[PDB]
Design a protein around this nucleic acid. Structure first.
Ligand code: ADP
Ligand code: ADP
Ligand code: MG
Ligand code: MG
Lengths: 759, 749
DNA sequence: GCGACGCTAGCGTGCGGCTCGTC
DNA sequence: GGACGAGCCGCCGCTAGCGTCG
């Protein structure tokens, strides 16, 4: 069994290392960072792991019995080192010195304070402005999926019917760590797939049901709570759990977010989110992100969002003011959570004090209608307790302002006089001794001292007690000092105790406003998004969309592509119609399709869009078969299947070249059947194809569009006007030629084309 | 800004920072790493970068009149941060404190001029330079090996190819190229690699563009290896004297790098035991042979080891981990060999005698026993390049050093007697005798014994729990131990240098040895591979006949189905359902031809192959895919000859079905008239019936087992007659109605 | 016939703070 | 001869090695 360390030598394991091993084997998959004084240490193989991983120095901690390896890092840089460690895939186990040193039974009590897992981080410097989720998956009456953001207390979940739905929901939440129920873990089949589709870190957790609701949900939830409660090291700060239904929002499968690069790019470029987000606060960015993850289906609320955006679009003054003020607004939502968790540092409070000072200016600028909570009381006491620049930890320098604590002002009082003492003494001795240069100094090793140079050694009085000798200086001590020096240490010792109590007192003060802090967070976050979305409209020429059943876009453009090129706007009118798009490659087909979806996606999120006039219907979902079964034809077909099994007459469907990847024959066949299917379905379907046949089909709601090329001076020039009607001819041979194909080879091709044309 | 440091305050740069800025300003395009004690430091704006790029602790360097930000890395950790910093596109200038307030630029770390082993791969590491004149000038240099070669290319297309065969680490474009905005905009896009500036004043003879490129390399590399370079005679070569292997083919075939999803022809194939070997073999794969004479000679050598298993196994054992004599030689020649190097060298020399026993005089290895006896006589059984430079020469090697070390030791003894003797008079069995730079030697007494501390003493320094004293009869014996510790350094370094020099006088013998072993290593390894995976010796002749050939890389991962092929300047179409094996087949055919013309055995039973002049592929995936594919095709049509192996994989796709078949037919014809060995996997059954005299059909098929379709991987003769598109959409999950509708449509046509 | 305490010099990650030599 | 390198001690805690309770 386990209970031994890697150290060479016989005899027993020292009292400390003993305590080290005792905790180290309770968290087998965590790198244990042992708190020994002002350093975090690791011994044995664990010490080696560290040294190399962090380039630290490898040393040893020798004892009578044996000698083991040692590696440590100064607490000062804990987080600094933590971050690096986490990014490599380690779970950290922080074992701290619980009870103080001065009052310990020899060996100071040490226990694991917190656990640092990628999906349960609370450390602000270790978190992105974005939401950080822990996700739990379980079975038992369908698929159970739950998320928890330990830093904000967001706690939500649902139950999905298919393995497909689960993966979609999971992929739109971008979980940073996943807990898999017993069943799924065992099943090597599933695990492979999951591990392959979501390269996220996996972790073990007990899936004992918790609360009420579908068995599956209760298990995932419990798993979350079980795990998080363990890494936090105490009760968690949870928000009302949301058992939500993804059927209430617009469907955005994984293939759509990916193909549309809503959150992640295909080529280290921009994404819809990067381009759209100009929020100033972190909760703001989170809100916006949340909105994109689940676009609304309901006209009313979307119109509500659009009014508030339009508001700031008009009030440029106001809009720039609110944004000018939010630049300084801290993550209240997270701060409120750190407080409730009794983790708030003086850094946090200083931050809180600044944010709260912005409130009243926002109140004035927008009016008392914003609903902002009145924290003026809290804000003030903070300004009256904290230094203009709050230090990191309490025991060190001044944290509380002078004049705030009667008990503490008397302490700095006594300390000031006490220090002055030694100053007075200097002059008294420089006289009695007649030694002009006589200094009075201090230092950790010997305490307060009287210093005298060599030229005056024979001039030093009997009374002086030697304490330290240097190259050409000697240091003495009088009895008076010895006393007054301990009066100073007592003070200093009392000054810390109190300064920290006052801090803790004031903190708890802010902790009773946590909920108020939370609601200001929400209000100010919406404020942030509304102004940001407006900022984006103004800067990039977007307009307010109008909803209805007919889609009529005028001068629409791709929101991301136009960011890096003179983009030629285009129009579109659809209505449960089947719109085929033909024309030469490099002309614009694929970009046109993508442009259409993004516009729809932006509108149904409440943002203005990249067009001159945009009348949009409320799509129940955006489905795509763009870009991307051993074969390609099979992979593309599997997608058409999915798209075909969920599209409704209220779905925006975008097909790009469906039918490619096989025989010309099965090509047209499949494409035709498919195009007929989506036609019957009655969804809004944009199909970019190379089978001119599909354009001639005998369908009642079939419309035709095309892009074109003009064979000019230097070959072929592709314009991007998406003109009405079908494409006339294909430009393959022409392109081949342009590509450099030997002139005879091309001419032979033209002859073959014209021969087959002759029937 | 020269003399300017990013900081706050008026007053001049203190003495130190003044020095720093003086060097910093000498190597502008580089990040200057300044030595300060046990760290490499950066100041001002540079410190901010270093801190940024490595995420370090920004702090400040303060003097009365100026404070500037600083950040640094431990002198030790150096080579580890250098790597991160290099990979990030950083060029490094190292400034070391000349072994005892004085600093200078020792090295210049650069992607394509690296000399430090821990920063180099087993493979060659080139610095390339491209210039212009009548045709392109390409020249490669590998400062760690001395390899110096070049050629003159006619087409920018051929340029890129040679540039890619070599995978340079750093490129130097002449000024005409750097100013040509279109080229540079293209070069970066197609060749993501660090581009450096460098003078191009011609050097030597031959074409103007070559001499110029050659000069850039020489001039630039010397700046790096601060002085004369160690280089073997410049080798001018002709890409036309070897089998052509263009970037398209190298990538398509994954000779050196995978399309992601590991395993290259090279990894599978590579089984060498030394770096020179790995380099040799890579060199061969890089330029396959045309001439049967040499090829048959290589195959002869390979067979030698396939027969002599005892020999093969005995040689691969001895070579295990054997050092890189070629690089070692170069470091010695450059005057950069570390004591650790000399130690590695002696180990290598010790093994050399054994290899000669096994092989024999035939081989021609040099007898270096004398150098090996020397190295065994002077070096400790573990030289330490890092540990000072002391504890380097062993006892009894050099009398002078020996006498000094002995005297020193006595001193230490004295300061061990003063200890035993004193506490044996003061009753303080605690009393210590330690030393410190500040005052030299001393006596150390703990707090308790101050009452038992005599007056013959003289305190010099007091500590928390103890105080250190002095004595009269102790100064001399200090000013002596030191005068020696110094001399021991002075002398030991002399001997080390003397010894290092003897090793350096055997540079050629080392290079000659390295080279021979490299061949032996390669032949013996190509033998090992043939014996393990069952490769056969190929035969050369105007007809291609392969009996049961397998894709060499693919098979190491699954049960492979071998196949046959009989070509002869014919157009061989391959139809059949996707997922059956068309693309793999073309590729195995190509890899086999490659292994053969490299002098390796091949993955088959019988392989009679023609000596192709080049293998041109068109396989796999602002510009439409179609246009890119056509450009590749145009390349082949302008290159392929009747002795070329051309592999067309579904050419024609990416456009209309008409233009598709039309283009595809015109190409198939052009290659037919060309008379090259063409394997054309297509979906256009039209090609299958062109009826050309040298056209031929082959296809793969699929059965309808259990649920849907199972693809057998057998390449049968003649064309396929079906397409399983609809059959596949069915398995894909397409709604039965849509599937049925498709079938109705299919037939209806 | 030896378990149990007490006193206390000393080491050691990374790194302020203190000292000292040179001018 | 006030200021600038250049380098050693010790932090906070635990231990081992010594005396000693009796
Ligand atoms: N409306 C447009 N305005 C400006 N550039 C466009 C437009 N549509 C396409 N492009 C350009 O054409 C290139 C892409 O071809 P694309 O139109 O997507 O493919 P195709 O027409 O082959 O489906 C894009 O990278 C972009 O630079
Ligand atoms: N000779 C073979 N033996 C075993 N598997 C093979 C063989 N040739 C091909 N395959 C299989 O086919 C896959 C590749 O199909 P591929 O060669 O690309 O066929 P195609 O181009 O007709 O789609 C391989 O990864 C493997 O699964
Ligand atoms: Mg396209
Ligand atoms: Mg294929």
């Amino acid at each position: 069994m386990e209970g031994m360390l890697k150290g060479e030598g016989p005899g027993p394991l020292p009292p400390l290392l003993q305590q080290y091993v005792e905790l180290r084997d309770q968290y087998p998959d965590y790198l244990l960072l042992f708190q020994v004084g002002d350093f975090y240490e690791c011994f044995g193989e664990d010490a080696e792991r560290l040294a190399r991983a962090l380039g630290l120095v490898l040393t040893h901690k020798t004892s009578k019995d044996f000698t083991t390896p040692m590696a440590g890092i100064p607490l000062r840089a804990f987080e600094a080192y933590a971050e690096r460690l986490l990014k490599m895939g380690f779970r950290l186990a922080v074992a701290d010195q619980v009870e103080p040193a001065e009052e310990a039974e020899g060996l100071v009590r040490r226990e694991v304070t917190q656990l640092l897992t990628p999906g349960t981080l609370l450390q602000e410097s270790l978190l992105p402005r974005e939401a950080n989720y822990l996700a739990a998956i379980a079975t038992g009456d369908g698929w159970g999926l739950a998320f928890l953001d330990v830093s904000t207390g967001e706690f939500k979940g649902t139950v999905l019917k298919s393995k497909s739905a689960l993966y979609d929901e999971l992929f739109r939440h971008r979980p940073a760590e996943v807990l898999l129920a017993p069943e799924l873990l065992e099943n090597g089949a599933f695990l492979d797939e999951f591990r392959k589709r979501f390269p996220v870190m996996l972790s073990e957790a007990p899936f004992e049901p918790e609360g009420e609701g579908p068995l599956a949900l209760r298990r995932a939830r419990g798993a979350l709570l079980a795990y998080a409660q363990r890494t936090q090291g105490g009760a968690l700060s949870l928000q009302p759990f949301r058992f939500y239904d993804p059927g209430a929002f617009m469907r955005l499968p994984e293939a759509t977010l990916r193909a549309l690069e809503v959150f992640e790019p295909l080529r280290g470029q921009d994404t819809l989110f990067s381009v759209l987000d100009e929020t100033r606060t972190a909760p703001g960015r989170r809100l916006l992100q949340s909105w994109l993850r689940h676009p609304l289906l309901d006209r009313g609320p979307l119109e509500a969002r659009l009014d508030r955006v339009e508001g700031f679009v008009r009030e440029g003054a106001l809009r720039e003011g609110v944004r000018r003020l939010l630049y300084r607004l801290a993550d209240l939502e997270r701060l409120a959570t750190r407080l409730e968790l009794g983790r708030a540092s003086p850094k946090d409070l200083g931050a809180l004090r600044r944010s709260l000072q912005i409130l009243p200016e926002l109140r004035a600028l927008l009016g008392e209608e914003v609903g902002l909570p009145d924290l003026s009381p809290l804000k003030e006491e903070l300004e009256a307790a904290l230094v203009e620049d709050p230090p990191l930890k309490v025991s060190e320098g001044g944290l509380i302002r002078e004049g705030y604590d009667p008990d503490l002002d008397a302490l700095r009082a006594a300390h000031r006089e006490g220090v002055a003492y030694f100053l007075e003494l200097e002059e008294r001795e420089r006289e009695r001794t007649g030694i002009p240069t006589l200094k009075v100094g201090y230092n950790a090793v010997f305490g307060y001292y009287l210093e005298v140079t060599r030229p005056y050694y024979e001039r030093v009085p009997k009374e002086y007690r030697p304490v330290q000798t240097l190259k050409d200086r000697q240091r003495y001590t009088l009895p008076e000092m010895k006393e007054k020096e301990r009066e100073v240490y007592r003070l200093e010792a009392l000054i810390r105790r109190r300064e920290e109590e006052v801090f803790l007192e004031v903190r708890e003060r802010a902790k009773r406003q946590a909920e108020a802090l939370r609601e200001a967070a929400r209000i100010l976050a919406e404020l942030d998004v509304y102004a940001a979305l407006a900022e984006v409209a103004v800067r990039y020429g977007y307009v307010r969309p109008r909803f209805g059943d007919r889609l009529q876009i005028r001068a629409g453009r791709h929101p991301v592509v136009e960011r890096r090129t003179e983009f030629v706007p285009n129009d579109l009118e659809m209505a449960h119609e089947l719109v085929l798009i033909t024309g030469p490659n490099m002309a614009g087909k694929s970009t046109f399709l993508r442009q259409t979806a993004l516009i729809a996606l932006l509108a149904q999120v409440g943002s203005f869009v990249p067009a001159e006039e945009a009348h949009l219907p409320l799509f129940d979902g955006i489905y795509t078969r763009i870009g991307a079964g051993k074969s390609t034809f099979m992979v593309e077909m599997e997608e058409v299947a999915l798209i075909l099994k969920e599209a409704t007459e209220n779905s925006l469907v975008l097909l790009d070249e469906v039918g490619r990847g096989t025989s010309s024959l099965d090509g047209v066949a499949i494409a035709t059947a498919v195009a007929e299917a989506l036609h019957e379905r009655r969804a809004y379907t944009l199909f970019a194809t190379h089978y001119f046949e599909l354009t001639a089909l005998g369908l009642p709601r079939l419309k035709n569009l095309h892009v074109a090329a003009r064979e000019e001076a230097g070959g072929l020039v592709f314009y991007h006007q998406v003109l009405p009607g079908p494409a006339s001819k294909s430009y393959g041979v022409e392109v081949a030629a342009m590509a450099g194909l030997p002139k005879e080879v091309v001419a032979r091709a033209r002859a073959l084309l014209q021969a087959m044309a002759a029937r």
